[PDB]
Design a protein around this motif. Structure first.
Motif, PDB file in Angstrom:
ATOM      1  N   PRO B 123      33.927  57.316  -9.986  1.00  0.00           N
ATOM      2  CA  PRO B 123      33.201  57.156 -10.821  1.00  0.00           C
ATOM      3  C   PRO B 123      31.992  55.855 -10.859  1.00  0.00           C
ATOM      4  O   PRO B 123      31.834  55.062 -10.601  1.00  0.00           O
ATOM      5  CB  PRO B 123      34.391  56.054 -10.799  1.00  0.00           C
ATOM      6  CG  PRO B 123      35.258  55.620  -9.321  1.00  0.00           C
ATOM      7  CD  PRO B 123      34.850  57.031  -8.580  1.00  0.00           C
ATOM      8  N   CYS B 124      31.407  55.839 -12.182  1.00  0.00           N
ATOM      9  CA  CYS B 124      30.168  55.060 -12.295  1.00  0.00           C
ATOM     10  C   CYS B 124      30.519  53.552 -13.233  1.00  0.00           C
ATOM     11  O   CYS B 124      31.408  54.069 -14.564  1.00  0.00           O
ATOM     12  CB  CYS B 124      28.799  56.244 -13.062  1.00  0.00           C
ATOM     13  SG  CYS B 124      27.848  54.304 -13.493  1.00  0.00           S
ATOM     14  N   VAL B 125      30.849  52.034 -13.130  1.00  0.00           N
ATOM     15  CA  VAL B 125      31.235  51.223 -13.492  1.00  0.00           C
ATOM     16  C   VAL B 125      29.962  50.754 -14.104  1.00  0.00           C
ATOM     17  O   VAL B 125      29.029  50.383 -13.922  1.00  0.00           O
ATOM     18  CB  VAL B 125      31.578  50.220 -12.790  1.00  0.00           C
ATOM     19  CG1 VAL B 125      32.305  48.970 -13.293  1.00  0.00           C
ATOM     20  CG2 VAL B 125      32.714  50.536 -11.800  1.00  0.00           C
ATOM     21  N   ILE B 126      29.825  50.725 -15.582  1.00  0.00           N
ATOM     22  CA  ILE B 126      28.395  50.156 -16.112  1.00  0.00           C
ATOM     23  C   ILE B 126      29.416  48.533 -16.828  1.00  0.00           C
ATOM     24  O   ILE B 126      29.894  48.911 -17.687  1.00  0.00           O
ATOM     25  CB  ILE B 126      28.188  51.451 -17.746  1.00  0.00           C
ATOM     26  CG1 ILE B 126      27.931  52.931 -16.974  1.00  0.00           C
ATOM     27  CG2 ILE B 126      26.892  50.782 -18.487  1.00  0.00           C
ATOM     28  CD1 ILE B 126      28.846  53.366 -17.149  1.00  0.00           C
ATOM     29  N   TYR B 127      28.775  48.058 -16.749  1.00  0.00           N
ATOM     30  CA  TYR B 127      28.727  46.165 -16.872  1.00  0.00           C
ATOM     31  C   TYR B 127      27.951  45.984 -17.463  1.00  0.00           C
ATOM     32  O   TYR B 127      26.356  46.115 -17.751  1.00  0.00           O
ATOM     33  CB  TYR B 127      29.346  45.265 -16.014  1.00  0.00           C
ATOM     34  CG  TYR B 127      28.432  45.459 -14.752  1.00  0.00           C
ATOM     35  CD1 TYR B 127      27.890  46.031 -13.994  1.00  0.00           C
ATOM     36  CD2 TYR B 127      27.185  44.360 -15.544  1.00  0.00           C
ATOM     37  CE1 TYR B 127      26.037  45.804 -13.581  1.00  0.00           C
ATOM     38  CE2 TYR B 127      26.185  43.370 -14.570  1.00  0.00           C
ATOM     39  CZ  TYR B 127      25.667  44.564 -13.587  1.00  0.00           C
ATOM     40  OH  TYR B 127      25.145  44.361 -12.592  1.00  0.00           O
ATOM     41  N   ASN B 128      28.190  44.872 -18.671  1.00  0.00           N
ATOM     42  CA  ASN B 128      26.960  43.524 -19.333  1.00  0.00           C
ATOM     43  C   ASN B 128      25.995  42.623 -18.476  1.00  0.00           C
ATOM     44  O   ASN B 128      24.777  43.085 -18.092  1.00  0.00           O
ATOM     45  CB  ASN B 128      27.620  43.394 -20.859  1.00  0.00           C
ATOM     46  CG  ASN B 128      26.796  42.655 -21.015  1.00  0.00           C
ATOM     47  OD1 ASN B 128      25.202  42.487 -21.240  1.00  0.00           O
ATOM     48  ND2 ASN B 128      26.711  41.926 -22.743  1.00  0.00           N
ATOM     49  N   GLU B 129      26.799  42.240 -18.228  1.00  0.00           N
ATOM     50  CA  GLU B 129      26.208  40.224 -17.361  1.00  0.00           C
ATOM     51  C   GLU B 129      27.403  40.462 -16.538  1.00  0.00           C
ATOM     52  O   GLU B 129      28.207  40.857 -15.943  1.00  0.00           O
ATOM     53  CB  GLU B 129      26.854  39.610 -18.034  1.00  0.00           C
ATOM     54  CG  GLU B 129      28.108  38.984 -17.912  1.00  0.00           C
ATOM     55  CD  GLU B 129      29.171  39.565 -19.005  1.00  0.00           C
ATOM     56  OE1 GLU B 129      29.452  40.907 -19.689  1.00  0.00           O
ATOM     57  OE2 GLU B 129      30.436  39.122 -18.498  1.00  0.00           O
ATOM     58  N   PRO B 141      33.110  52.803  -1.484  1.00  0.00           N
ATOM     59  CA  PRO B 141      33.007  54.296  -1.287  1.00  0.00           C
ATOM     60  C   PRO B 141      32.873  55.316  -2.642  1.00  0.00           C
ATOM     61  O   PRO B 141      33.808  55.538  -3.092  1.00  0.00           O
ATOM     62  CB  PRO B 141      33.539  55.542  -0.310  1.00  0.00           C
ATOM     63  CG  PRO B 141      34.219  54.344  -0.449  1.00  0.00           C
ATOM     64  CD  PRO B 141      34.455  52.944  -0.578  1.00  0.00           C
ATOM     65  N   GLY B 142      31.423  55.903  -3.349  1.00  0.00           N
ATOM     66  CA  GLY B 142      31.642  56.230  -4.645  1.00  0.00           C
ATOM     67  C   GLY B 142      30.640  55.505  -5.634  1.00  0.00           C
ATOM     68  O   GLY B 142      30.239  56.474  -6.567  1.00  0.00           O
ATOM     69  N   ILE B 143      31.217  54.653  -5.869  1.00  0.00           N
ATOM     70  CA  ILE B 143      30.441  54.079  -7.714  1.00  0.00           C
ATOM     71  C   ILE B 143      29.569  53.252  -6.651  1.00  0.00           C
ATOM     72  O   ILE B 143      29.251  52.714  -6.247  1.00  0.00           O
ATOM     73  CB  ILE B 143      32.158  52.995  -7.130  1.00  0.00           C
ATOM     74  CG1 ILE B 143      33.488  53.153  -7.745  1.00  0.00           C
ATOM     75  CG2 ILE B 143      31.369  51.122  -8.006  1.00  0.00           C
ATOM     76  CD1 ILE B 143      34.560  53.599  -6.460  1.00  0.00           C
ATOM     77  N   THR B 144      28.957  53.229  -7.802  1.00  0.00           N
ATOM     78  CA  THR B 144      27.667  52.886  -8.021  1.00  0.00           C
ATOM     79  C   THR B 144      27.842  52.330  -9.481  1.00  0.00           C
ATOM     80  O   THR B 144      27.313  52.418 -10.863  1.00  0.00           O
ATOM     81  CB  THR B 144      26.481  53.527  -8.559  1.00  0.00           C
ATOM     82  OG1 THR B 144      26.917  55.005  -9.844  1.00  0.00           O
ATOM     83  CG2 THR B 144      26.074  54.816  -7.018  1.00  0.00           C
ATOM     84  N   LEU B 145      27.349  51.107  -9.379  1.00  0.00           N
ATOM     85  CA  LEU B 145      27.450  49.998 -10.828  1.00  0.00           C
ATOM     86  C   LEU B 145      26.312  50.521 -11.596  1.00  0.00           C
ATOM     87  O   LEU B 145      24.699  51.020 -10.946  1.00  0.00           O
ATOM     88  CB  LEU B 145      26.810  48.157  -9.868  1.00  0.00           C
ATOM     89  CG  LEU B 145      28.933  48.032  -9.948  1.00  0.00           C
ATOM     90  CD1 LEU B 145      29.312  48.282 -10.931  1.00  0.00           C
ATOM     91  CD2 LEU B 145      28.306  48.859  -8.470  1.00  0.00           C
ATOM     92  N   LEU B 146      25.772  49.961 -12.918  1.00  0.00           N
ATOM     93  CA  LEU B 146      24.380  50.245 -13.356  1.00  0.00           C
ATOM     94  C   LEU B 146      24.868  49.172 -14.918  1.00  0.00           C
ATOM     95  O   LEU B 146      25.743  48.307 -15.267  1.00  0.00           O
ATOM     96  CB  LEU B 146      25.336  51.798 -14.179  1.00  0.00           C
ATOM     97  CG  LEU B 146      24.208  52.789 -14.146  1.00  0.00           C
ATOM     98  CD1 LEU B 146      24.321  53.885 -14.843  1.00  0.00           C
ATOM     99  CD2 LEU B 146      23.682  52.523 -13.572  1.00  0.00           C
ATOM    100  N   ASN B 147      23.503  47.967 -14.947  1.00  0.00           N
ATOM    101  CA  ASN B 147      23.133  47.237 -16.283  1.00  0.00           C
ATOM    102  C   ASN B 147      23.408  47.862 -17.424  1.00  0.00           C
ATOM    103  O   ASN B 147      22.472  49.391 -17.404  1.00  0.00           O
ATOM    104  CB  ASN B 147      22.578  46.594 -16.324  1.00  0.00           C
ATOM    105  CG  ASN B 147      21.977  45.512 -16.960  1.00  0.00           C
ATOM    106  OD1 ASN B 147      22.871  45.594 -17.983  1.00  0.00           O
ATOM    107  ND2 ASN B 147      21.255  44.664 -17.323  1.00  0.00           N
ATOM    108  N   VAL B 148      23.800  47.992 -19.000  1.00  0.00           N
ATOM    109  CA  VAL B 148      23.856  48.563 -19.518  1.00  0.00           C
ATOM    110  C   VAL B 148      22.636  48.947 -20.419  1.00  0.00           C
ATOM    111  O   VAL B 148      22.188  49.927 -20.731  1.00  0.00           O
ATOM    112  CB  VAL B 148      24.436  48.587 -21.513  1.00  0.00           C
ATOM    113  CG1 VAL B 148      25.440  49.132 -22.318  1.00  0.00           C
ATOM    114  CG2 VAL B 148      26.781  48.120 -20.077  1.00  0.00           C
TER     115      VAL B 148
END
Lengths: 52, 196, 50, 86, 122
Positions: B123-129, B141-148
């Motif tokens: 899963p891809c976890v997109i966060y603000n701050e 393992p698997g998770i990539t974080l993203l800034n919006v």
RNA sequence: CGCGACCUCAGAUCAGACGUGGCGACCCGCUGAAUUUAAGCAUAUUAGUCAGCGGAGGAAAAGAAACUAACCAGGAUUCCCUCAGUAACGGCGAGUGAACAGGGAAGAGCCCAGCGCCGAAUCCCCGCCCCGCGGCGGGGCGCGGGAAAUGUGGCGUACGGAAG
RNA sequence: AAAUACCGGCACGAGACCGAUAGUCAACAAGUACCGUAAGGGAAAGUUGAAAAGAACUUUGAAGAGAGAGUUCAAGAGGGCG
RNA sequence: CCGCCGCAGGUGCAGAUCUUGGUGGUAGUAGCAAAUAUUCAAACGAGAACUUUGAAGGCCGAAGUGGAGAAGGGUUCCAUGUGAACAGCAGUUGAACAUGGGUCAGUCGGUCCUGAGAGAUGGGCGAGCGCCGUUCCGAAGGGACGGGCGAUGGCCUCCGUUG
RNA sequence: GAAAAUCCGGGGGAGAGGGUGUAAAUCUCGCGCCGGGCCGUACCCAUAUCCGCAGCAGGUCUCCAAGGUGAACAGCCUCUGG
RNA sequence: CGACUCUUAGCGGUGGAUCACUCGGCUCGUGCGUCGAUGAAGAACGCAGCUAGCUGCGAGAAUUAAUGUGAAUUGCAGGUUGAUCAUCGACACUUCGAACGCACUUGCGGCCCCGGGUUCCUCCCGGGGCUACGCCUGUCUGAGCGUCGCU
């Protein structure tokens, strides 16, 4: 030198040297035929230096 | 041995290769900003659709809603045990469990070129701050974080296939409407951009 | 020849002491890769330079 | 009789061991090293032989002084100071 | 006899030289013992005597130069051995003093027009 | 004839320092080809390029206008984008070929000689004491020596400056 | 000064690079052996096994070489041997 | 290690008198034919046409197949062991291999001298590394007999080393 | 139809020596005392230690030189040595 | 029946392909940006108990001292008050080399100073330190019918 050997053999072994004869070997090291003065037995001083 | 062998030629043993590879190869391809935007608009759009995310391969059978928007309490997290328990309760964990099953050896010369292990995109976890969500989630393992405000096309649609399973946060999900705009209101955080 | 210089006789003296085989305790070592002495120099075959 | 017989008369040497570069290229009549040029203060090296340079440059020998200059650089060429004893 | 460097540096100038001329005699007996064929118990000792000559001669040569660069400490001309070896170019530099010499015209510019700590508003 | 000055060129294992050689990717100064291209070839082109020679540095060189301009004007140098494959060069053939303006990276300015003013107010070095530094510097103290009026130092340099 | 250059040097990090006829000439005692009077030219050559446990012992032979025995998951891995 | 979807290329060989390595047929073939020659017993040894010893027969025939050196080689010298490889048959042999040994000088050479020549300095030239030049465009000698003025060693005697 | 090192004899006679002695200065005369460093020194030197890739019928500087036949260091035969 | 010959297969050789490995390259990037008369780079020759090479080092010679580290090194012997490793600041660093007394033979000195041969005593012997070129500042010593000066 032949002088430097004579004054070394005289001081190291409490003896005196009649003459020195030096050749450099095919190996590259120098060999000294240190003819002792005949008031010393070379076999009795060969035992003193500790060879058998 | 070399005396009278043969030196110059692509065919000659020793020798050079035919047309030796130069470092002034054009490695980089530049894309238009509008086209770049219309990859991310389409990639987020397929993320919402349930069928595309399962066709991408994600185990979202038991996920609640398929735009998985979570609270902003998730950005306060600092430990992986907190990050694990969230993905258990949102029922995204069967996708993390699928990534563990996909942890195997690479086939080929990649294994002696610092590409030893290969695994699946989770899963891809997109966060603000960031107040620790990245610290809390990076070890799974698997998770990539993203800034919006900094969404990547390589990470929202990996392989060029569309519908990577995106887990949103509350504050992340509302900022999209201003980042890319709607169809009566242009993007405010982009100087001149309407949706395609 | 018989008539040598001290520099040449020193050169020949070195090339004698390099022209001996390996010790047979060297191949019983851990990171051992030496079978024989590859730089052994026979006096018919290779003529030493000069 | 330009080949096999003429080879027989070869018994007097042109070059000997040069005493800068050690190579067997010190000509006896010209009295100059065909490798390094010994009587010349300056080392004979030419940019048309890239291979001949990498045979005889700073990578070849020990660097018995220049190896410690690299070791002595990375603390700032300190002198006189010893570390604190036991 | 185990010979350390701790227990030699307190010893005398005349004391060390006799201990050296004892180890030289001990090594003179071991070099013979290699040639007279036998005693592997002696052959392994010749290193222990070779390195203990190196220990005593160090302590001799250290206390030579401690005394010399103590002797020439306050002196303005000292031997080229005792002068600080850095890189050659680093000896050819200007002094700690000569770099810090401003001209009278430059001291005036520092004085009358000193660089101000300032900030501007938006 | 001698003796003291100076000038001029000498000699020293004179007191104390300094240069030489190497490395050489990058940098500066010279010197400098022919392959090749023009379907030949000589000018051109290759190319101020390779080779040759010298000199460096952590960068080098450049640099505070004897400039750009022709505007309502800009304002050292260097580098990037662009100008521009353009103006121009060229058996006007093959080919060659900048600059300014503009947008940026960085941004920093300065010192003499001369002209003049103050009693050479300036400098290097030797002896002793005294701090003191493995960048030999600081304070004394010397009818101690020398450089220097064939010009040292302070003020001051085209943005003007000095004196009252 | 700074912005700037840097296939040499000393440290490092990395790769949609090469995989022992490739990639440096050189993964190894490589600018080594060897060649040329010299200037210079210039190689070939990685892999026992997890661990030497590297084959005791007996036997035919002058020995090299075998035949049984033994070690090992394996000698169908026997010291240039995956 | 691989299937599918994209991505990328130093991506497909029978040839190039291709490059490198390997192996064939020819082929157990050509060959092992320059300078007269070997033979008998014995010894060592697993093993003898070849080694060694003895006896015989021959050759080189003093411008030699003899006894010594110079160049060059560089341990080939010598002994002892070895018989895998090498010595184009073989080997108990060897200049092979492996262990040790061996070159002794006032008088023999080098060193010294100058020969033809080479080659700094000064000078000249040269963009420059440098080149020319060797007595030439040069203040090119650091040596000795004598004399006061002095220091010194030995009964400073009067002299040695000196200024 | 070589130069120099090195060595010597002479020509001059500046000086020097002692005043009848324990004579002197002085001797290229006879003996006595001490010292001579450094480097090379083995072996082959050619139908097998060199150079022609090799134990290659090639090439490669010299010295010594018996008896007979004969003009002969020719050829042929023999001794020493091989 | 043959021998021989050919084809195919099994096995065994010859050979070293293939595959799988990789303490090596190659390429890009970064920080630094340091040689030498205080003897550099390079070369020569030595140095290990048993050692040829490689690496390491220099007559203190596969290293010394100090520091950190804390029990090895290892082919085989042998012998914590710090084994060994790294670090490296103290010390040491043979010959040639810009290469330096003059030559390149390791051939010849010159001068000062020490110790033996002694009984500073001049040869001899050993040791020690100087003994290169170009050049700057000063220093010393003399040069010139250089320009003068006074006696």
């Amino acid at each position: 030198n032949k002088h430097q050997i004579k004054q070394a053999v005289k001081k190291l072994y409490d003896i005196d040297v009649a003459k020195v004869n030096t050749l450099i070997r095919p190996d590259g090291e120098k060999k000294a035929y240190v003819r002792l003065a005949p008031d010393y037995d070379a076999l009795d001083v060969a035992n003193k230096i500790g060879i058998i | 041995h070399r005396s009278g062998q043969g030196a110059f030629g692509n065919m000659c043993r020793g020798g050079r290769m035919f047309a030796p590879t130069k470092t002034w190869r054009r490695w980089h391809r530049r894309v238009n900003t509008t086209q770049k935007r219309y990859a991310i608009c389409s990639a987020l759009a397929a993320s919402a659709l349930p069928a595309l995310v399962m066709s991408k391969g994600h185990r979202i059978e038991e996920v609640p809603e398929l735009p998985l928007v979570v609270e902003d309490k998730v950005e306060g997290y600092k430990k992986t045990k907190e990050a694990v328990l969230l993905l258990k309760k949102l029922k995204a964990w069967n996708d993390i469990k699928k990534v563990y099953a996909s942890q195997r050896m690479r086939a080929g010369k990649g294994k002696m070129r610092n590409r030893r292990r290969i695994q699946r995109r989770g899963p891809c976890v997109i966060y603000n701050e960031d107040n620790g969500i990245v610290k809390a989630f990076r070890n799974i393992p698997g998770i990539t974080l993203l800034n919006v405000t900094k969404l990547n096309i390589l990470k929202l649609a990996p392989g060029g296939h569309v519908g990577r399973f995106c887990i949103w946060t509350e504050s992340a999900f509302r900022k999209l409407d201003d980042l890319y705009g709607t169809w009566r209101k242009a993007a405010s955080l982009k100087s001149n951009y309407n949706l395609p | 020849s018989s008539h040598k210089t001290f520099r040449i006789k020193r050169f020949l003296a070195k090339k004698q002491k390099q022209n001996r085989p390996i010790p047979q305790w060297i191949w019983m070592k851990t990171g051992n890769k030496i079978r024989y002495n590859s730089k052994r120099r026979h006096w018919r075959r290779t003529k030493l330079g000069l | 009789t330009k080949g096999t017989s003429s080879f027989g008369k070869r018994r007097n040497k042109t070059h000997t061991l040069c005493r800068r570069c050690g190579s067997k290229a010190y000509h006896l009549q010209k009295s100059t090293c065909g490798k390094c040029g010994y009587p010349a203060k300056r080392k004979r090296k030419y940019n048309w032989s890239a291979k001949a340079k990498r045979r005889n440059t700073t990578g070849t020998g020990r660097m018995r002084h220049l190896k410690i200059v690299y070791r002595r650089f990375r603390h700032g060429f300190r002198e006189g100071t010893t570390p604190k004893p036991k | 006899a185990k010979i350390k460097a701790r227990d030699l540096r307190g010893k005398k100038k005349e004391e060390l030289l006799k201990q050296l001329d004892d180890l030289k005699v001990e090594l003179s007996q071991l070099r013979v013992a290699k040639v007279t064929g036998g005693a592997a118990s002696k052959l392994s000792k010749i290193r222990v005597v070779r390195k203990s000559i190196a220990r005593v001669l160090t302590v001799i040569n250290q206390t030579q130069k401690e005394n010399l660069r103590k002797f020439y400490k306050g002196k303005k001309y000292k031997p080229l051995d005792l002068r600080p070896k850095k890189t050659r170019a680093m000896r050819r530099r200007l002094n700690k003093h000569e770099e810090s010499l401003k001209t009278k015209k430059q001291q005036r510019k520092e004085r009358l027009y000193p660089l101000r700590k300032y900030a501007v508003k938006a």
